[PDB]
RNA sequence: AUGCGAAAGCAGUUGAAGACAAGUGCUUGUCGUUCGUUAAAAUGGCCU
């Protein structure tokens, strides 16, 4: 309704409903919140990216998180957090963005090195390689994109 | 040192502290927080008597300053805000947005 | 370093104050890193001047 | 249009005579896609400009420079990109590394 | 060496001297880039294995 | 005005209304009237600044003889010029690169 | 170069009139002129 469209519009919002609104909104409104909530999370924050839901809740969802927290406490976050939809939500990043690049070195830190794959590791290897290749082939293209004698002439005129 | 690298740029920041050299009060943009300088981290509340270590303004925060060890003196370019510390709870509220 | 580093993970992850532990290195690698942008500037204008001369 | 060379060959031609539109479709279409995986297109693009910048600068004012500015935006945020993410690269090689020293 | 190529682009095509020297100067540019590449990697390292 | 006082030196845009001559260049005594002069900067300059932009023919700087015979002008690239009256016939002095 | 913004960038901007000079009444230029808008040159370098 309007009059809850416009607090969440408004900045403050004081503690309970930031508590638990997310499981309520879990549309329009959703979207509402996602792009606007002072207080939001993590745990919660987590479940919804990955969520395979993919409205482009992956985008949003990482930016909102990172221009909010902190790369530590996301790693501790998602420490507690499971591993087996981390290896689902990987699966579908490298099937196919800075802000999600940023999400994988964060998965990374979280992981560690105990718990990998090697098949599905592999994988990620070739298509961090050639998503690479093509980053640094983008970059020459961007800096490409930034960048007498007349000993004897046979020649005659129109007079 | 403390260095979070977030993706976002404020331009607007601000900074004070206490005079025990203890508590420490960065107002990034829209956000208070006080960290320990012992371990410059957010000063948890074991008591948990609603003296949360982040403070969420209305406006995104240009000056802090302290007077004593009791209250916090935090301008947005909307208002002024007066805060007891003992209390967590704001004493002042001042018009400036107009002008 | 990259055996090194590979080999005893564990026993530094368990120590820890790395930053200062690992000074040097951590300077170093962030100098080199800071190196690296106007390196690929200066790679892609000889590029470009490479081909200029070499198409003819 | 498929080997670089013949691309330099008929790139020559089209700077004999096509310039402008070819440039302006190449534009538009890598700015929609930052992350094709063909460079036959990206060494089209990197070839004119290495062989004719500045007459393509001259020719036009609006339409090309505001096209050029918007994939230059794009372009810009792939350079932001890249530094960490070959780090991310590096890190997967020395996981790959320890698993080795794993299995033997 | 950048302004240096912005200006002598021509003498470059005419003498053959300044063509090797160039060549030369573009081995040693894409060894470090290199050099400074796995730096990066190993840097990375260090932010993993903190 | 001379270091005096005695003298007053200036230039008035009247030539420009009546001719293609743009300034004129007039000294006078002011305790008396024992000196008066008149004459067009067109005269006075030389017969090159005519194909070069307004920053030769831009006059700069304006300084007086105490005995009414020697005046200073300076102009914008810097190259002095000395005039004396008698003959109305001048020197070129330069070495400031800018006005 | 304006505004906005982070050290990125995003939008926006380049108007007339008057005057005078040169050129053949017409072409170009210029301005110690106006209002209107968010708007490269004079061989000539640093004291004791």
Redesign the pocket.
């Known amino acids: 309704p309007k009059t809850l469209t416009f607090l969440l519009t408004h900045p403050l919002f004081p503690l309970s409903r930031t508590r638990n609104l997310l499981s309520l909104l879990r549309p329009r409104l959703f979207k509402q919140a996602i792009v606007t909530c002072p207080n939001l999370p993590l745990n919660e924050l987590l479940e919804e990216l990955f969520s395979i839901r993919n409205r482009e809740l992956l985008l949003d969802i990482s930016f909102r998180i990172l221009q909010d927290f902190t790369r530590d406490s996301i790693k501790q976050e998602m420490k507690k957090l499971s591993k087996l939809d981390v290896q689902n939500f990987i699966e579908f990043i490298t099937s196919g963005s800075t802000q999600l690049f940023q999400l994988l070195s964060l998965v990374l830190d979280s992981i560690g090195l105990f718990s990998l794959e090697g098949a599905l590791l592999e994988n990620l290897t070739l298509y961090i390689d050639k998503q690479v290749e093509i980053a640094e082939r983008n970059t020459e293209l961007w800096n490409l994109i930034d960048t007498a004698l007349p000993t004897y002439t046979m020649e005659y005129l129109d007079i | 040192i403390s260095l979070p690298n977030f993706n976002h ?4 920041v601000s900074l004070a502290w206490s005079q025990d050299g203890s508590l420490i009060f960065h107002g990034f943009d829209d956000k208070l927080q006080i960290l320990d300088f012992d371990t410059f981290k957010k000063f948890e509340s074991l008591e948990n008597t609603k003296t949360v270590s982040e403070f969420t303004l209305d406006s995104e925060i240009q000056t802090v300053k302290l007077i004593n060890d009791t209250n916090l003196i935090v301008a947005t370019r909307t208002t002024l805000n007066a805060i007891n510390l003992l209390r967590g709870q704001v004493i002042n509220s001042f018009d400036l947005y107009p002008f | 370093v990259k055996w090194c580093l590979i080999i005893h993970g564990g026993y530094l992850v368990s120590i820890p104050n790395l930053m200062s532990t690992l000074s040097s290195l951590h300077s170093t690698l962030k100098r080199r890193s800071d190196l690296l942008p106007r390196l690929l500037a200066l790679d892609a204008r000889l590029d470009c001047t490479i081909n200029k001369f070499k198409t003819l | 249009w498929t080997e670089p060379e013949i691309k330099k060959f008929i790139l020559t031609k089209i700077n004999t005579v096509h310039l402008s539109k070819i440039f302006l479709t190449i534009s538009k279409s890598i700015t929609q896609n930052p992350w094709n995986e063909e460079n036959l297109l990206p060494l089209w693009l990197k070839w004119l400009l290495t062989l004719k910048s500045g007459e393509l600068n001259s020719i036009k004012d609006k339409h090309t420079k505001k096209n050029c ?2 994939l ?2 794009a372009l ?1 945020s792939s350079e ?1 990109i890249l530094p960490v993410l070959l780090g991310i690269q590096g890190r997967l090689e020395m996981l790959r590394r320890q698993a080795k020293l794993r299995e033997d | 060496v950048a302004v240096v190529l912005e200006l002598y682009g021509n003498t470059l095509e005419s003498s053959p001297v300044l063509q090797e020297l160039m060549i030369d100067l573009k081995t040693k540019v894409r060894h470090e880039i290199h050099k400074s590449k796995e730096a990066q990697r190993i840097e990375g390292m260090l932010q993993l294995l903190t | 005005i001379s270091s005096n006082g005695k003298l007053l030196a200036h230039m008035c ?1 009247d030539v420009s209304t009546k001719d ?1 001559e ?2 004129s260049i007039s000294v006078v005594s002011l305790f008396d009237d024992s000196v008066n002069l008149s004459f067009p900067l067109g005269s006075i ?2 017969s ?2 005519q194909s ?9 700087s304006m300084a007086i003889d105490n005995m009414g015979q020697q005046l200073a002008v300076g ?1 914008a ?3 002095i ?1 000395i005039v004396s009256l008698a003959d109305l016939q001048i020197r ?1 002095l ?4 800018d006005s």
């Open positions: 740029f404020s331009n607007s | 500015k918007h230059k935006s810009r932001e | 845009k293609h743009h300034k300059l030389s090159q600044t070069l932009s307004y920053n030769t023919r831009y006059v700069s102009f690239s810097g190259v010029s070129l330069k070495w400031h690169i």
